[PDB]
Amino acid sequence: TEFKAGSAKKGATLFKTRCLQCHTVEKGGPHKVGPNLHGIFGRHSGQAEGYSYTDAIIKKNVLWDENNMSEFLTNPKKYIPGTKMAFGGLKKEKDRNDLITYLKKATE
Amino acid sequence: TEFKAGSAKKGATLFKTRCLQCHTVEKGGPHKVGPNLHGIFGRHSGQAEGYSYTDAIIKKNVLWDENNMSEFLTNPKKYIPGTKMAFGGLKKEKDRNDLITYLKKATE
Numbered sequence: 407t408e409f410k411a412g413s414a415k416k417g418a419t420l421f422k423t424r425c426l427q428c429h430t431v432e433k434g435g436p437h438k439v440g441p442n443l444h445g446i447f448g449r450h451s452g453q454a455e456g457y458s459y460t461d462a463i464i465k466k467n468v469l470w471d472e473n474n475m476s477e478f479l480t481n482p483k484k485y486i487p488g489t490k491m492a493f494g495g496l497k498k499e500k501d502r503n504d505l506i507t508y509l510k511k512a513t514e
Numbered sequence: 515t516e517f518k519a520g521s522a523k524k525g526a527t528l529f530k531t532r533c534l535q536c537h538t539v540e541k542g543g544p545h546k547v548g549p550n551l552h553g554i555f556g557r558h559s560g561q562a563e564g565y566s567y568t569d570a571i572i573k574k575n576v577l578w579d580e581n582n583m584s585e586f587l588t589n590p591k592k593y594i595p596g597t598k599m600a601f602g603g604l605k606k607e608k609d610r611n612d613l614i615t616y617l618k619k620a621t622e
């Protein structure tokens with residue numbers, strides 16, 4: 407596409423150090439600061455039940471593919487102005503690839 | 515996204531009149547002129563087994579989302595030059611929406 411598979415192992419540790427603070431990925435895992443991401447690929451933005459999303463992400467109505475996921479992760483607020491997600495971004499494409507590789511796998 | 519849900523019923527009849535000639539959508543349905551489309555959303559282009567795809571679609575490496583699916587259907591060859599898919603396209607957004615609505619549902 408414009409996303410190439412990376413390291414799932416590398417990707418799992420990026421998750422623990424950069425996303426775990428606010429999210430879980432397991433099926434049946436809870437919402438924390440951010441929503442549980444189980445089954446996020448192919449779902450539109452703002453639709454997990456029981457979570458208070460911003461007006462913004464709901465309206466962005468993003469359909470989540472490994473490619474969408476990558477612009478997003480590069481600069482969250484630039485991609486969804488108004489988002490409450492407080493994350494600067496992952497500037498290197500290799501880190502992004504490793505992380506989506508992990509995600510695509512753990513959120514299934 | 516940039517795809518809004520349409521009529522699944524409308525969408526099923528567009529399929530019979532415009533795509534059925536070359537494709538099936540059921541799980542366990544065969545390849546004909548074109549490949550069986552069961553489970554196409556979220557899959558990349560050119561990966562159904564047992565089907566001879568063009569060099570072109572394999573290389574396009576499209577990741578299939580209701581939005582990708584829509585530019586594609588607008589003008590197949592313009593989107594994947596080299597494709598063997600012989601279909602002029604569906605120019606009206608409403609027809610496209612009805613058709614992807616059906617597809618998203620029947621290919622699951």
Ligand code: HEC
Binds near residue numbers: 421496
């Ligand atoms: C807390 C300081 C966060 C960190 C670190 C990360 N995310 Fe996040 N995320 C956070 C919030 C509060 C929300 C909801 C935002 C809103 O505007 O309501 C999000 C949302 C997501 C989404 C969209 C979810 C949906 O259902 O559409 C995704 C895809 C996502 N977050 C992923 C994600 C990743 C992979 C992170 C590590 C690189 C990560 N976020 C960091 C809060 C926080």
Ligand code: HEC
Binds near residue numbers: 534549559568571598
């Ligand atoms: C025969 C005259 C066709 C008609 C009418 C339609 N399609 Fe088709 N499709 C055809 C071929 C020969 C192929 C493979 C092309 C190649 O270059 O190898 C395709 C491919 C698809 C795809 C991509 C499949 C994949 O696995 O990536 C899709 C998504 C698709 N076709 C859908 C589709 C729809 C929805 C149609 C009706 C509007 C339709 N096609 C018409 C042949 C023919």
